[PDB]
Amino acid sequence: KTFKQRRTFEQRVEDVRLIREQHPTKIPVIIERYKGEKQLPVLDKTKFLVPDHVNMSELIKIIRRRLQLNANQAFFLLVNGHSMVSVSTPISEVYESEKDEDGFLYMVYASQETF
Numbered sequence: 001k002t003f004k005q006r007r008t009f010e011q012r013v014e015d016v017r018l019i020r021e022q023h024p025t026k027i028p029v030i031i032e033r034y035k036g037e038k039q040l041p042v043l044d045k046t047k048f049l050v051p052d053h054v055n056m057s058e059l060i061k062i063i064r065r066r067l068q069l070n071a072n073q074a075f076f077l078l079v080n081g082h083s084m085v086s087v088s089t090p091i092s093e094v095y096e097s098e099k100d101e102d103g104f105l106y107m108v109y110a111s112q113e114t115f
């Protein structure tokens with residue numbers, strides 16, 4: 001059902017290596033809806049190539065637009081399984097510290113802070 005369940009560790013590593021070769025300025029991001037989530041819709045895809053200069057605040061705005069949310073729908077994003085300490089960090093810096101061993105950066109979204 002989840003990305004890590006659909007693709008082998010070998011397959012995920014090789015896909016991150018191809019993104020380094022073909023899209024060297026992009027961060028490879030996996031974005032999934034929390035398995036408990038009732039309110040927010042599912043995304044149209046799972047794997048996102050994010051420009052490495054955007055900060056987490058801008059990436060939250062990007063995901064809100066992709067989900068076509070309105071002003072008063074709540075949205076919380078986990079990175080590497082936990083809350084973001086800051087939304088001001090460039091995603092290139094977030095990637096270096098929070099990347100998975102497969103080389104993806106894993107994010108999960110919910111309408112509650114309580115995941």
Ligand SMILES: CC(=O)Nc1cccc(NC(N)=O)c1
Pocket residue numbers: 016017018020021
């Ligand atoms: C055994 C082997 O190929 N290793 C390796 C390690 C890091 C990066 C890459 N290539 C890449 N396109 O990111 C390949």
Ligand SMILES: [Cl-]
Pocket residue numbers: 022023024025026
């Ligand atoms: Cl690129």
